[PDB]
Every structure is written in C-alpha cells, then in structure tokens.
C-alpha cells in the first residue's frame, strides 16, 4: 500500500537544498538564473568566502545579461560565506545601485530579502534593475547545522 507515497509526491521537490539565492530581473531584460552553493563546502570552509557569483554582459560571468554598454563585463558580484548570511559585491565600471542608493564598489553588503540591484545609472533610459530572491530553506539548514560541536 503506497497510499502515503502518493502524498509524498504532493509536497514535490523541496527547494533550498543547495540553491543559495535566485536573481530575477524586474525590468524584463535578463533571463532569471539560479545561483547555488554546496552546503558541505560551506560548512567545511571556516575562513574566507565559499562561493561568489559574477554578473554582467559577459558569457563568462556566472550571470549573463542582455547587452547594456553602460554595464561592464562583470557588472556585479555576489559572495556567500562569512558565517551563513549572504553578501552583495558591486563590480561595475559605472557602479551598482541598491533601491536607488549607490553602494561602494567592490564592497561587501548584507543582502536583503527580495532586494533589488539597479545598474547602468547615468541616463534615465539607461538604467536596468534586478531583484534578488532568497529562500529561507537554505538558512534553515545552516541554522539546523552549526559548525563544529555536533549534537
């Protein structure tokens, strides 16, 4: 009797097993991508950063943008580590914006829930906005599993 089994499929695949965060463009320019990092690697690393994403118009960049001259090859970068939270690192030639407020380039910032990054500032019609989606599931694993001292 697989009566219960049928219910298991109801919940479907649980998101947040490795997928750190997801970037979604609100202005409709760049295709939504999924950023992820392995938990084992994060827990194993007790120094420096674990995994960082590079975004821009470059096909190398962990994030492929549309084609904005105002933006650089790797306009912005996202780093995950420290303790468990997320960090946002701007790396554009023109600058990276957060909700209209320009942040310090190549600087680490505490990520925000459903936050948004604006880029290509200079001309009213040459600005592009992006949205960062973070899953609480990922945070649950980190909290449920503390580094060192196993219970």
């Amino acid at each position: 009797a697989t009566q219960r089994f049928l219910i298991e499929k109801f919940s479907q695949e649980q998101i947040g097993e490795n997928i750190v965060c997801r970037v979604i463009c609100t202005t409709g320019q760049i295709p939504i991508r999924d950023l992820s990092a392995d938990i084992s690697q994060v827990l194993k690393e007790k120094r420096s950063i674990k995994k960082v994403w590079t975004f821009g118009r470059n096909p190398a960049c962990d994030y492929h943008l549309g084609n904005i001259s105002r933006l650089s090859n790797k306009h912005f970068q996202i780093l995950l580590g420290e303790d468990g939270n997320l960090l946002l690192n701007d790396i554009s030639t023109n600058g990276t914006w957060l909700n209209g407020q320009k942040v310090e380039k190549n600087s680490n910032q505490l990520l925000s829930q459903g936050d948004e990054i604006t880029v290509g500032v200079g001309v009213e019609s040459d600005i592009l906005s992006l949205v960062i989606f973070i899953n609480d599931k990922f945070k649950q694993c980190l909290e449920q599993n503390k580094v060192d001292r196993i219970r």
């Binding site: 001259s69 105002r70 933006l71 650089s72 030639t93 023109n94 200079g122």
Partner: peptide, 13 residues
Amino acid sequence: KKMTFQTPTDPLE
C-alpha cells in the same frame, strides 16, 4: 583607427 566606445563611463572619480 576610428571606432565607437564600448563601456561609456560617466566622467567622474
């Protein structure tokens, strides 16, 4: 040579 720029960086520092 003569071509168009790639990344128009706003004059600033």
